[PDB]
Amino acid sequence: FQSMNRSALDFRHFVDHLRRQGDLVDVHTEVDANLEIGAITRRVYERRAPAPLFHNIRDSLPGARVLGAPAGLRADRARAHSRLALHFGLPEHSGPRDIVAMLRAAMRAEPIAPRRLERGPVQENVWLGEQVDLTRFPVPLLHEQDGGRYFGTYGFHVVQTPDGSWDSWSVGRLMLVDRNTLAGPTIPTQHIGIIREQWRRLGKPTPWAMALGAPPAALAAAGMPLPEGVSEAGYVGALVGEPVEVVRTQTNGLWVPANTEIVLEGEISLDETALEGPMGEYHGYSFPIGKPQPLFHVHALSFRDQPILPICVAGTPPEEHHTIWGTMISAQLLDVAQNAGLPVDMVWCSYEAATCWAVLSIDVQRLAALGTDAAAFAARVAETVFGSHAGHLVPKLILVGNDIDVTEIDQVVWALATRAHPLHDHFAFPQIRDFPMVPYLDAEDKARGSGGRLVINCLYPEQFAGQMRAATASFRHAYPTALRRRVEERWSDYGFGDA
Amino acid sequence: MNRSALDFRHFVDHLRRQGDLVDVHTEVDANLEIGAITRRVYERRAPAPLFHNIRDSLPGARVLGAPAGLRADRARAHSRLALHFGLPEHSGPRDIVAMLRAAMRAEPIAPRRLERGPVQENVWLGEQVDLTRFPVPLLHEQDGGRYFGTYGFHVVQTPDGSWDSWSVGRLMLVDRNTLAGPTIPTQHIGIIREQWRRLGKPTPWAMALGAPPAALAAAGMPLPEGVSEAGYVGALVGEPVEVVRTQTNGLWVPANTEIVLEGEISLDETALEGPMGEYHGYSFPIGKPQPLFHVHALSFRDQPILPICVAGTPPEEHHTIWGTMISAQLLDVAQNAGLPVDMVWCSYEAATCWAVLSIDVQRLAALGTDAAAFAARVAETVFGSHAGHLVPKLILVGNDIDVTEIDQVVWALATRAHPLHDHFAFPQIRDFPMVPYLDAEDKARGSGGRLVINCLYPEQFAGQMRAATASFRHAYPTALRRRVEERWSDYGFGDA
Ligand SMILES: Cc1cc2nc3c(=O)[nH]c(=O)nc-3n(C[C@H](O)[C@H](O)[C@H](O)COP(=O)(O)O)c2cc1C
Ligand SMILES: Cc1cc2nc3c(=O)[nH]c(=O)nc-3n(C[C@H](O)[C@H](O)[C@H](O)COP(=O)(O)O)c2cc1C
Ligand SMILES: [Mn+2]
Ligand SMILES: [Mn+2]
Ligand code: NA
Ligand code: NA
């Protein structure tokens, strides 16, 4: 119980804790960062195997390690989310709802500022100027048709508004360009893109750092679409109940977590670019052609002894673009909806849907008082959700009554198949602007910048009057409470035991 | 194992030998308790329960719950279903579909008529008929009555004797020798019975309960009109089904059936039947008048086993049997019509409310068409068939995904269906009347619930694909995939 709480704030301890859970495999065989690491980890995601810690990567800095699947799922269904739950210090049986509830409580708690320290483990090794050689690290080629090797797939950028009011921590990919330059996207609706654009009106480049192997709770928050201007570091402290220990970078004054595995520092160039990508991505596809992206100059880097580089091998679910990102989006969307007065009691970005839809659980004993109907409700939800920072990331919304558990894909499918009426429940919103990464967009959607948004209504019409056409024929809903308890009571005595 | 396909009692014994059967010796109430246990068995994917000690029931009589439920062990999940066809425990949807389709291509093997058989060990005639002596369950709390037949099939015969039809249909208990159940006019029972209404006499009928599992499966299969189920079963298992004559009306039933009911379907007598939890997962509140089935005689084996199906949320036998049979029949219909379809699957999770069509991407381009035209073509062919009429929604997706895996179907629905281009409603095509989302407008018009969801990217109709799949199988060369599989144990995973 103590090991779990230290796991939230210490990546190295997090890894040791995974091993104690039996959720880590120590790979001592020599492995090739050219595709092999990426292949092993992909198979780990899809088999829901323990996270691999790679101890020996060919042609890499001696002692350097790689952690694959830092928040992959486990095969054991009772502990399937334990690796993700451990990012917040939660026990192994924690599930989606437990994680979301804790993420929301931290939103309403006052931030706990980071504790500034003079020294930290991240400073045990410092490479300055000409010592910087990113190619010495075990930088993987993650997919066969990738456009380059990716240094940052599981770290977050650290930048600061010029006025010093807003400390932004955000996860974004960074491709390896040469020994001291990286390149990665800065979509204008993400917070790095906004602050970076705050520096272009000052004639200066953006001072920048990236933390890799950062405190797991800090990494999760960096992958969370918190509202604009909100500092991620204070939300992490509030989430774990104590400040995140930080130190100053070696060359630009930004504060990064003190026990980070690897810290990069430099600046984001104002107009230099390099062809970046393509890369297998969260939607599950590898698109064929890359795009020019801003260059990240690395003036210095520091790392702990025997540094662990965590990676994410993006693709078909479930990987960290779903377990981390989708989870964080779900909790933010729940807060967005409830704050707007919408009758939503849970939101879940089904991992199986590759973070391309969110299922909203509708409190049916609140629906009647709205005096509305499917078409009006869908439009109201669309404006509210899609207009939020978190809701902008997700193109499809499914609305269903809270009689189903929206975290269970089988129940969501049951509701889609049996409740969505083909003529009445398909609400496209072609005027709402799209998130540009949605894989089914066509040339026309990309020219207008909209066309991909959808609300699928699974609320029967009578539910807007507080009624329901039929009861559910299931164990829970087709038998009286006294009989259900008797069956649950005697289950083992009938002869079933644990099955 | 092939014994199991032709012998319900051996099938039960085979399940126990597999470790897939729980013998319940605790006394249980057929009033709701048996249904509640079995419903939980479906949802937990537990072993099939055999109830030996049924309160208030005929001595020696037993009840088999979840005869075709799924198992928690994912490697053997479909073993109980597969054993209906004599297939091994690791058989999956595709193996089952392939075998059901080979059976369509073999010529039928007529049943072998015997004069004696185990089903005749006990005979009740006329006033001996007391259906209430059997462990007739009340399956759901709000059900309209107790159901004797949830896992048996009607046996009727054309007046010409050209067509012996076996069809699964529910039968509610009305009184000690009368039952009532639906005979929807598009089903084959309703067509043959309404051929008898043109004759002056009622429809002679029998129901086999605890029949040979292979016969039960076929009876739950929408084979074309005029096709005799019994001959298809023989072709499926490779040998005739042994059948004997009924004791009182000359209809022929399988010889080792657990329980055989005999009588006739009255022309115009009805009784308020239902409601009952149904395949779509819902219990609607009000019943309907349905034809009365008069039971003049019945026969059963010593210590008879009454199989039951507790309809509701998936997966139960309305999905594992019915859905599977529909999928195989739909694959045949589609391929016979020339559609470029290589697999069809009625996802159990969708409660037999949608069918996923796996599109052979290498044949699509030669059609020179597009999503709208293809969807309309698929709609006409599929919904127009006997099997396709049962399913209101079709999903078309390329065969790069495994359409039997709901996680992959969901990935495709979410990442390939464009909200503006891929939602093809067909409000003019007649509906299957049980579809739960129909409104008053559809039930008065007789149509409005049909839909085709297109998950084929537009470039696929030209034989192209916008992007490769980022997965282990599709993002790495074959040699690396082999090396990772070979050295998996060296890495430290050991069966992970
Ligand atoms: C492993 C992982 C990788 C991610 N990579 C990217 C990325 O490359 N580009 C991007 O725009 N968002 C990416 N995200 C999502 C962002 O981290 C997320 O939207 C976050 O809210 C951004 O922070 P911000 O709200 O301060 O902009 C990733 C998330 C995770 C979990
Ligand atoms: C367990 C089970 C129960 C079924 N119950 C019914 C039913 O009550 N009413 C009905 O119309 N069809 C029911 N069916 C569907 C029929 O068995 C199926 O449509 C079959 O093809 C009918 O035979 P037919 O083609 O000769 O009409 C059931 C199927 C199964 C597997
Ligand atoms: Mn932010
Ligand atoms: Mn038939
Ligand atoms: Na963030
Ligand atoms: Na049939």
Residue numbers in the entry:
A (entry chain C): -2 to 496
B (entry chain B): 1 to 496
Task: Give passages from the manuscript.
A number of PA0254 variants were generated in order to establish the proposed role of N318 in substrate recognition. In the case of HmfF, the corresponding residue is H297, which was established to be key to ensuring specificity for furan-type substrates. Hence, we created a series of distinct N318X variants, restricted to amino acids with a size similar to or smaller than asparagine.
We here report that the UbiD-like Pseudomonas aeruginosa virulence attenuation factor PA0254/HudA is a close homologue of Bacillus megaterium PYR2910 pyrrole-2-carboxylate (P2C) decarboxylase and show that PA0254 is capable of prFMN-dependent decarboxylation of P2C as well as carboxylation of pyrrole. Substrate screening reveals HudA and selected active site variants can accept a modest range of heteroaromatic compounds, including thiophene-2-carboxylic acid. Together with computational studies, our data suggests prFMN covalent catalysis occurs via electrophilic aromatic substitution and links HudA activity with the inhibitory effects of pyrrole-2-carboxylic acid on P. aeruginosa quorum sensing.
